[PDB]
Amino acid sequence: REAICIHIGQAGCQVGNACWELFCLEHGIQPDGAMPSDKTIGVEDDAFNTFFSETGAGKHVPRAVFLDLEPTVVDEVRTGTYRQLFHPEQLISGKEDAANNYARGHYTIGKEIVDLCLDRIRKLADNCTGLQGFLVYHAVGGGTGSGLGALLLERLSVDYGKKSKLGYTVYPSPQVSTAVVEPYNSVLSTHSLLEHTDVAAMLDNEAIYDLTRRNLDIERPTYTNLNRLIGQVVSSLTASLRFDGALNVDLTEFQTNLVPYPRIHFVLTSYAPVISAEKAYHEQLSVSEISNAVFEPASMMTKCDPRHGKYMACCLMYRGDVVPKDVNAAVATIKTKRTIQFVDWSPTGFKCGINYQPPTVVPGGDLAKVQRAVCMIANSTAIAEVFARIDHKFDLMYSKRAFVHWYVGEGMEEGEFSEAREDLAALEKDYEEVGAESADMD
Amino acid sequence: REAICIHIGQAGCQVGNACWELFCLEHGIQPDGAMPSDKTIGVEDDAFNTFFSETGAGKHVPRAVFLDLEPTVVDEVRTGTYRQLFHPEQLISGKEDAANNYARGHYTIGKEIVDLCLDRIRKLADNCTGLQGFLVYHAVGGGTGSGLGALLLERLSVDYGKKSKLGYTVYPSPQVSTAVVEPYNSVLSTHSLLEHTDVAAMLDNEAIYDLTRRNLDIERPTYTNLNRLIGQVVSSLTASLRFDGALNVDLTEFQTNLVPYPRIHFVLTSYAPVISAEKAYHEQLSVSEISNAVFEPASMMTKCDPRHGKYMACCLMYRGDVVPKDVNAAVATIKTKRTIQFVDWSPTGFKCGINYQPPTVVPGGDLAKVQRAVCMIANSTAIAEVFARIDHKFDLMYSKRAFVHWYVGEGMEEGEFSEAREDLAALEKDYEEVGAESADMD
Amino acid sequence: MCSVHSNPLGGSRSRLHIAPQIIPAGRQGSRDGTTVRELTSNHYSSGR
Amino acid sequence: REIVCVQAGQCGNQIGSKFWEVISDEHGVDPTGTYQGDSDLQLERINVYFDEATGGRYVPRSVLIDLEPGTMDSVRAGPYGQIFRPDNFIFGQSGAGNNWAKGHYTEGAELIDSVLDVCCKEAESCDCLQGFQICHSLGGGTGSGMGTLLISKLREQYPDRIMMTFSIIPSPKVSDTVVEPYNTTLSVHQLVENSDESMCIDNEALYDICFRTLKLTTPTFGDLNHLVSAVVSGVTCCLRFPGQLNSDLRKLAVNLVPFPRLHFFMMGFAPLTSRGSQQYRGLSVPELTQQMFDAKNMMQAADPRHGRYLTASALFRGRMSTKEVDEQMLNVQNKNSSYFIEWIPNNIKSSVCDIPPKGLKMAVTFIGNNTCIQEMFRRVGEQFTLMFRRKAFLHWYTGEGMDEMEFTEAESNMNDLVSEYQQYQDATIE
Amino acid sequence: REIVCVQAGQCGNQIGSKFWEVISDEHGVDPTGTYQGDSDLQLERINVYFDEATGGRYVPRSVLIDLEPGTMDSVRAGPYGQIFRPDNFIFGQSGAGNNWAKGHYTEGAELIDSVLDVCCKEAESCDCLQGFQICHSLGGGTGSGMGTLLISKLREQYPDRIMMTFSIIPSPKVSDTVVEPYNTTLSVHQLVENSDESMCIDNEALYDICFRTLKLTTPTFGDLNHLVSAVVSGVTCCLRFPGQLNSDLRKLAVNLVPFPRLHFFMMGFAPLTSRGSQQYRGLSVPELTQQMFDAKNMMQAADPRHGRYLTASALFRGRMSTKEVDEQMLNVQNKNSSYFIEWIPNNIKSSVCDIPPKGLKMAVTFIGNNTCIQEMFRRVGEQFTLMFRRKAFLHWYTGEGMDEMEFTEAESNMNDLVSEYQQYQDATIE
Amino acid sequence: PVSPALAVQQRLITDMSSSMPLFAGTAKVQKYAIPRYAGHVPSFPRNV
Ligand SMILES: Nc1nc2c(ncn2[C@@H]2O[C@H](COP(=O)(O)OP(=O)(O)OP(=O)(O)O)[C@@H](O)[C@H]2O)c(=O)[nH]1
Ligand SMILES: Nc1nc2c(ncn2[C@@H]2O[C@H](COP(=O)(O)OP(=O)(O)OP(=O)(O)O)[C@@H](O)[C@H]2O)c(=O)[nH]1
Ligand SMILES: Nc1nc2c(ncn2[C@@H]2O[C@H](COP(=O)(O)OP(=O)(O)O)[C@@H](O)[C@H]2O)c(=O)[nH]1
Ligand SMILES: Nc1nc2c(ncn2[C@@H]2O[C@H](COP(=O)(O)OP(=O)(O)O)[C@@H](O)[C@H]2O)c(=O)[nH]1
Ligand SMILES: [Mg+2]
Ligand SMILES: [Mg+2]
C-alpha cells in the first residue's frame, strides 16, 4: 500500500514537481491539499493512501521529502503555487552546493545534513502500517546527487534492512554533455549504488529529446517536458498499487522477476503511446500495435540499441481497456519475431500486468488522450555498451590525473578511483559471462 | 481483400491524387474522411476495407504512402483539399531531387530515405489480415522514379517474399519527350524491373492523347484528363475485389492466366466506352460493339500496334449491367475474325470477368454516364517494338558516352550500362523465340 | 469537471475520469452482452 | 436411406443453392425451417435429406467449402441461405489462384482435415448411410483440386457406399479460363479411379436448351442452375416417394455400368415446353418418349447420332399406366435398333413414381450411357497436347511442386479411357 | 456428508467467489442468507456445503486465506460477499513476492497456526466429515507454497479422509511469471505424495474453448472462472441429490486410480454451445457423448490422440434412460478400441442423477485419466533443467533458506512420474 | 464548452500548452497545414 518518495538535488526535485502535479490530478486533490466537495464517492475508498495521508481536518499531505544542498530550488517550491501542499519541515535545504564534487557531498557537506533526512524518513515510516518500498529520484552526473544519494541509501539500507528500494536514475548521455567531470562522478556513484539498490532504471536526456522531436512535433523541448514524461512512467508503474485490475503487481515481484544475479540489476524503460493529438485521431491503437511498438528502438527512453544484446527478462505493464487474451496473443507474436532474442537459459521470458485505469491527460501536456497504454521494464546485455564508453572517458582523463586535486583536497584517497574502475571492469566481465551460451552437454 | 498503394515521384503522386478522388467518390467518403452523418442506408457494407481502415471514431483513412525527394508536390497534398484524409506520417518528403540521375536516387540520396519507407510499409502490412498485393505507380524516365522504384522493389521483394507486386508505369513516349537522358533511365529501370515485378502495365502518353482527341473531342488536353483515365482503369481492375459479380477474378488469377513464362509479364491496357456526353444520347451501347471496340487500335493507352504481333492471353473485365450470354457471343465473334491471331500454343485464349457495379461519374469529369463498360488487359508480342526503339536510342547516345560522366561521378560504374543493354537485348531475343511457330511433325 | 468510469471488464471500486470534454483517441473495442452464464444457463432463450 | 451433399467452389455452391431451393420447395419447408406442407407423404421421407433440429426445425445435411468467403457470403445472403447450419461453412483466407496444384497441395491439405471431420460428424449421425452427392466444376481450381481430394478421402473412409458427382466441364466454345485443359485432365484422372458414377454437364448444351426449346430471350445462370437442380432432384425422387416400380441408386449403377470404368453418363429431363404451346398439346407417354430421345433435350455437346447406347434408364413421375411405358420403350428400341448395342437384349430400364413435380401432370428424367462422350474427352486431350508440347504455363504448377511425370501419366490415362470407349463402340461378333 | 473448502491466493479466491455464487443459486439462498428455494430437494441436503446460523441464516463452510488483503477486499465488495463469516478471512501484511520459499517458510509458518485453528474448528463441528476441497494455482507464490503447506498439515491431521484439489498450471506458450518452473515443480512434488486426486487446467485451453466453441469476441477471466466453477459444482452433484445410480468422491477415486501415483486427471463439461448455433441442435445422449470426447472440449493443452485412456468417468444429470448411457459407452469403447488400455476390460464408469442444473435439460461432466499428462510434466522438467543448470534466479530461494537438494529431489520425483506414465503406456500382456 | 468536432480536438491540447512562445516559426503553429510541414512559416505577429 504505502510508498515513500525521496527527491535529491536539482533533477530529482524538478522531476518531483511534475510527479506530484500528476498524482494530484489523478486522485483529484487540489494544490492546497483539500479535496473538493463535488468529488464524491458512492463507497469509501483508499487509493489516495499510497501517496497521501490525512491530518483529520481533511487536508491531504504527501509522503515525500525534498533534499537539496543549494536553497534555490527548494525556495522555489516554497514560494511557488504548491506552497501549502508540502509540510514545511519536509522541505530541507542547505547553504551551498556540492560543486560537482562527489567528495564534497559525501565527505564534507552531506555529513552535516544526513541526520535531518533520517529523522524525517523515520517520522514518515512511523505513520505507516504497510510500507512496501522506497522510490528514489536523482542524477549521478552531479556532485550532491551522487554523494548524498549514496550516503543516504547506505544509511537507509542499514536502518530499514530488507525493505525494497527502487531507484530512478538519470545517467550521462552518450554525446550530449553538460559538465567536464561527469565520468568521475558517475563511476564513483555507481560503485556505491551497485551494493545498495534492488533495481536501477536508466534514463538519458538525448533519448527523450529524440522522442519529443520524432513522435511529438516539438522543435525546442525543455526539462518540463522530460519531467512530465518521467512522471507518466512512474504513474504507470505505481498504478498497479492504486487501482483495480486483472493482474496486479507488487513492488517485490519486480525484484523477484527481473534480477537474475545480485549484481545484474540495471534495467531499460520504454513507453508506447507517446503521440501528439493530431496524429492520435488518424490511427487506431490496438494492443498488438503498441506491443510491437515497445520493442522498437524508436520507443525507448535510453540511448542503447537492444539488437546488440540478448534479453533476460521483460515486464510489461498494461493500463486501461485491455483484455488478457490480446496480451497473450501479442506476446506470442513477439516471441515469434527473429530480431528479438532471449538468452537460452531464460525460457519463460515475460511478466504481465493488467490494470483498468487508463492514463491521465494533463491540461498543459503535450501527449494526446488515449484509452490504453503499455509500459515496459526489461533486462538486457546491451547495457554493457553504455558502461564501456563511460569507462573509456574515465581512462582518458585519469591517465593524466586531469582533475584529481579537487577530489583529493575535499577528502578522498587516490586509491578510490582505481577501486571503482576495477569494480566497473568486473561488471563488464559479468555481462560478458552471463551472455555466453552453454553448449557443453558432453 | 486488402491492397497497399505506394506512390513514387511526380507522375505517381499526381496519378495518385486522381485515384483517391475517384475511390472516395465511388465509396462515398467525404474529402475529410468522415462518412455522411445524415446517410442511413443501414447496410454498412465492408467494401471500403480493401482501401480504408477505421480509427474507431468513424473517420476513414487510406492505405497509401506518398514518396518524394522534392517537397513541392507533397506540400501541395498537405495544403490542398484532402489534408485531413491522409495520416501526416504517410506523406514522406526528402530534401533534394534525384536530378534525373538514376544513380543519384539509388546510390546517394534514396539510401537515406528508404528506411522510413520500409518502416511505413511494415506498419501498414502489420494492420492487415489478408493482404494480396502491392500497387506501385511510377515513371521510369525520371531520376526518383527509377532509383527509388528499383531500390524499394528490391527491398520489398526480399522482405515480403511471395506477395504480389503490380506496377502501373508511365514509359517514355516514342516521339514526345520531356528530358534528354530518358533512354538511360529507362534501360537502367527495366533491368531492375525484370527481376522484381509480377505484372507490368504499359502506358504511353501519345496513346492517351490520341484517345482523348479521337473519342473525346478535346483539342487541348492536360495531365488531369490523363490521370483521371488511368484512375478509371485501376478502378476497373480492382472493382472485382470490391463488389458482387457473376465471375470474380482474384489478383493471383491475373498472374496465372497472363504470364506464360516468368519474364513475359509486360501487358497492354485499353478501355472501351470512353465517350462524351453529347454523343452518348445518340447511340445504344451493347456488349458486342464495345467488345469489338477494345480490339480496335484507336482504343489502346499504349503506343504499340497489335497488328504486328500475336496475342498470348487476354483478360476481359466487364462491369455494369451485362449478361454472360452477351459476353460469350462477343468473345466467339472476336474469335471468328481473321485480323486477330493467337499463338498456336494458346488455344483457350480468353479470360472473362462480369461485375455488377457500373462505372462511377465524377462531378468535374468529362466522361458520360454509361450503364456498362469493358476493360482489357492483354499479353502480346507487339511490345517487343517498344524495347527495340529504346535500345536504338540508347545505342545512338552511348556511342560517345554522351552524359556518362554525371553518372560515374555520382557513383555508378560504366560497366553497368553494358550489362543492362545486354540484358534488354536478351529480352528482345526472348520475345523473338516465344513467337516462333514450329512444326513438331519432324 | 470529473465523472465516474464504468466497469465493463470487471472491478468493483469506483474510478475517477478526468476531463470528459476531451474525447479519447484510438479505436474503441467491440463489445456485446454475450457472457458465459447466458450461454451455459439460458438454454430457454427460444420457446419453440 | 440418407444422402450427404457437398458443394465445392463457386459453380458448385451456386448450383447447390438452387438445388436446396427446389428440394425445400417440394417438401414444403419454409426458409425459417418450419414445416408448412399439406400432405403426410411430404413428411414421411423428410429424413432422407434433412436432419431435425429442436422444436420443429429442419436443417439441410450439406457442407460448403471455398477458399475466399465471397461465394459463402453470397449464399448466406441469399433468400434461403439462413437454413444452413453455421458450423458447416468452411473457408480459408487465400485463393486457389485458378491453379490445380495450389488447390490440391498447398491450401488443400491445410483445410481438408476440417472438412473430413465435418463430413464424418454428419455421416456417423445417420442410422443407415447411402451414397454421398458432390457438385463441382472440373475446369476451375479449388473445385477441381479440392473436389478430387475430398472424393479420394471419402472413398478411403467409406469404400462400400456410393460416390456420386455432378460436374461441369469446359465447353469447346465458351473459353472462360485459359488453363482449362490441365485442370480437366488431372481431375478426370482422379475421377475415373475414385468415382462410382459421374454426371457431366456442358454450359453450351444448357444455352441451346434455353434458346431453342424454351425460347428464352435473355437467359441467366439462375435458369441454368434451375435446370441442373431439376435433374439432380429428379434422380433421387424414387428414393423418397412411393411408386409402382421402385428404384435406387445402387440398382441404377448395377443396370447401367457393364464394366467399372464405363461409368460416365448423360442426363435429360423431358417436359420442357414453352408456356404458350403447352395449352395446345397434352402430356402423354408417347410425347414424353419423343422429347426424351430428342438430342435437342440432351445436356451434352456430343450427339447420339455419332455413337451407340450401351444402356439407358428412364424414371417417370406421375399417375400413368405402365402399359404405355412398356410399349413406348419397346417400340423405340425396335424402331431405332441400329443405335443400340446388339449383345444386350433390352437396353432400357424403366421406373415409375406416383408423385410428379408440382404444376406438372407427369415428368420423366432420362439418364443415358452413350459412347459419344468419347468425342469430348478427345477434344480436351487435343487442347492439352497443343499446350503441353511448348510448356506454355507449366512453371506455375511446377513452382507449387508438381512433377512433370504427373502430366504424362494423366494424359496417358485419359487416352486409354478414350481408346476403351472407342474399342467397345466398334466391337463386333462373328 | 459435508465438504470443507479452502481458497488460497488470487486465482483461488476469485474462482471460489464464483463457485459460491453458483452453489448459492442452485440451493436458492438469498445473499442475505435466507432460504428462498422452491423445492424440498434443495433444502434436504443444504448441510453439505452450508452451516445453519440462528434465525434462518446459512453460512458457507469455507476458509479464505491470502497474504495481502487486496483480493479479500475485492470479494467482500462483491454481490454475495456478505454471506462469508468474518472470522474466516485470514490475511497478513506483506505479499508473497511470487516466491515459493517465502510463501512456504517465512510468512507461511507465521500464519499457518491461525488457518489450522479455523480449519479444525470447522472440521470438529461436522457430525461426519467428508474430504477437503482446495483451489489454488501452482505457478504463483502464496497459492503454491502456502496451499501445499496447509495440505500437508491437513493430511497429517486427517489421514483417513480424501484430499482433492483443483489447480491451475502454466500454459505451454506464454508465461505469466518468469520463475514458474520452480514453483510448479516443488508444488507437484508436494501434491504427488499428499494428494488423493488433483485436477489441472490450462488457461490456453479455456481461451481455445471460448474462441472455438463459444465464439466469444472478448472473453474475460470471469468466463474462465465460471467454467471452472461449473465443473467444480458438477463433480459433487451426486453427493447431494437423488438418482438412479448414486456415486461418491471415494467411489470415483476407487474406480479412477489404478495405482496410487497415477492420480492426475483431465476435466470437461459438455453442453457448451454458442447462442447462434443453439437453434440448430437438440440435446441428446449421443450428442453429449460425441462432444464429451472431442479434445476441443477438454480443458488442457495435451490431446488424447497422443495417449491412451486408463480409466474415465462420466456423471450425467437429468432424466434419461440407462440403456442409452451403457450402449453409448460400449459403442465408443469398441469403435476407438486402440486408444483404450487393453488389460482393463471396461474403462468407463457412468453415473446418473435425476436433478439437472436449472435451465439445462441435461448435463454431463467428464473426468479422464490419460497418459498424455506426461507431456506437460516433461515440458516443465525441460524448462527447469534449462534454468537450474545456470542458477538463473536461485539466490532468492537460497536466501530464504532452501537447500539445493530439495530442487534435485523434486526434479528426480517428476522424472520418475513421467517414467511411470510412459511405462504403463507401453505395457503389454505378453 | 468544447465541441466534439475533430479539428477542435486536434488543436485543443496545442492551444493550452505552457510553451507556446517556443513553438513560433515551426509547423505546429500553422493552423492552415498538417504537421511536419516543409514550407516557410513566419515568426512575427505582423507577418503571421
Ligand atoms: N531530465 C532532466 N535532467 C536534468 C534536470 N536537471 C538537471 N539535469 C541533468 O542532470 C545533470 C546535472 O545534475 P544536477 O542535478 O544538476 O547535479 P546536482 O544534483 O544539482 O549536484 P550539484 O551541482 O552539486 O548541486 C546534467 O546532465 C543535466 O542535464 C532535469 O530537470 N531534468
Ligand atoms: N501522365 C503523366 N505523366 C507525367 C506527369 N508528370 C511527369 N510525367 C512524365 O513522366 C516523365 C518524367 O518523370 P518525372 O515524374 O518528372 O521524374 P521524377 O519522378 O520527378 O524524378 P526527378 O526528376 O528526379 O524528381 C516524363 O515522360 C513526363 O512526361 C504527370 O503528371 N502525368
Ligand atoms: N452454369 C454455371 N456455370 C458457372 C457458374 N459460375 C461459374 N460457372 C462456370 O464455371 C467455370 C469457372 O469455374 P469456377 O467455379 O470459377 O472454379 P473455381 O474458381 O474453382 O470455383 C466457367 O466455365 C464458368 O462459366 C454458375 O453460376 N452457373
Ligand atoms: N483462471 C484464472 N487464472 C488466474 C486468475 N488470476 C490469476 N490467474 C493466473 O494464475 C497465475 C498467477 O498466480 P497468482 O494467483 O497471482 O499467484 P499468487 O501471487 O501467489 O496469488 C497466472 O498464470 C495467472 O494467469 C483468475 O482469476 N482466473
Ligand atoms: Mg545543484
Ligand atoms: Mg521531380
Side-chain angles (χ1 to χ4, degrees), chain E residues 11-60:
Chain E
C11 180
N13 283 276
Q14 287 267 53
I15 291 171
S17 74
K18 295 253 171 293
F19 173 71
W20 288 106
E21 284 172 16
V22 171
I23 291 295
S24 299
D25 214 343
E26 288 186 351
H27 288 179
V29 187
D30 201 324
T32 187
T34 299
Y35 175 83
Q36 293 291 45
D38 64 32
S39 179
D40 296 334
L41 282 296
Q42 298 187 14
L43 188 62
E44 66 177 345
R45 304 293 215 255
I46 200 161
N47 63 304
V48 175
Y49 278 122
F50 296 90
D51 291 331
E52 182 263 348
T54 78
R57 279 177 150 264
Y58 291 99
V59 288

Side-chain angles (χ1 to χ4, degrees), chain A residues 233-250:
Chain A
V233 175
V234 179
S235 84
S236 189
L237 295 169
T238 309
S240 191
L241 306 188
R242 297 179 295 137
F243 298 102
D244 296 19
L247 293 84
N248 290 288
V249 182
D250 183 359

Side-chain angles (χ1 to χ4, degrees), chain B residues 39-274:
Chain B
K39 181 265 290 180
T40 55
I41 62 175
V43 60
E44 308 302 330
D45 196 55
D46 197 40
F48 66 97
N49 181 356
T50 294
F51 287 142
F52 302 90
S53 59
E54 291 291 30
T55 71
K59 184 181 291 279
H60 296 347
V61 63
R63 292 179 146 116
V65 298
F66 283 61
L67 300 177
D68 197 356
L69 262 56
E70 63 189 1
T72 303
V73 182
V74 186
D75 280 352
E76 181 65 26
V77 186
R78 290 176 249 186
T79 60
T81 186
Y82 300 108
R83 313 190 294 280
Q84 302 212 30
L85 187 66
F86 301 105
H87 187 312
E89 290 292 339
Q90 298 223 135
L91 304 184
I92 305 299
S93 166
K95 309 285 291 163
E96 297 183 25
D97 58 356
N100 288 6
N101 276 117
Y102 157 78
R104 188 170 167 84
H106 205 171
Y107 300 106
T108 61
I109 302 299
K111 191 173 172 67
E112 295 83 3
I113 211 168
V114 71
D115 291 297
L116 276 68
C117 307
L118 281 296
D119 188 69
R120 303 319 327 280
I121 297 164
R122 292 184 291 112
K123 283 266 165 63
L124 296 179
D126 284 25
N127 195 137
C128 291
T129 45
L131 175 66
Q132 68 176 357
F134 297 86
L135 306 184
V136 188
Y137 317 85
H138 64 116
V140 300
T144 72
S146 296
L148 283 177
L151 179 61
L152 184 61
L153 280 296
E154 288 181 19
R155 300 289 293 276
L156 256 58
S157 160
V158 64
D159 290 337
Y160 289 69
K162 192 170 66 185
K163 289 298 183 333
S164 62
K165 305 176 202 37
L166 305 96
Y168 303 95
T169 308
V170 181
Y171 288 172
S173 170
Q175 283 177 282
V176 173
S177 279
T178 298
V180 182
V181 302
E182 287 165 2
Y184 289 6
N185 301 346
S186 53
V187 169
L188 295 165
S189 299
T190 188
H191 188 273
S192 66
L193 297 197
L194 273 158
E195 294 296 325
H196 300 283
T197 286
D198 302 287
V199 181
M202 292 298 102
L203 288 72
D204 303 330
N205 290 345
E206 281 191 354
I208 315 179
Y209 289 140
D210 289 337
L211 184 153
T212 50
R213 185 177 178 183
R214 203 164 313 298
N215 280 42
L216 295 80
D217 298 300
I218 299 163
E219 286 314 91
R220 300 186 71 96
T222 191
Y223 290 141
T224 58
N225 305 98
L226 306 187
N227 295 351
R228 215 83 49 72
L229 192 61
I230 294 166
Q232 291 286 356
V233 175
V234 179
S235 84
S236 66
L237 283 296
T238 320
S240 190
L241 306 188
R242 297 179 295 138
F243 298 102
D244 294 337
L247 293 172
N248 290 127
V249 294
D250 170 17
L251 298 188
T252 60
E253 298 183 353
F254 295 129
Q255 313 192 172
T256 302
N257 285 352
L258 293 169
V259 180
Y261 307 101
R263 286 165 64 176
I264 309 297
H265 66 60
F266 300 92
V267 300
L268 313 176
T269 184
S270 307
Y271 194 93
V274 63

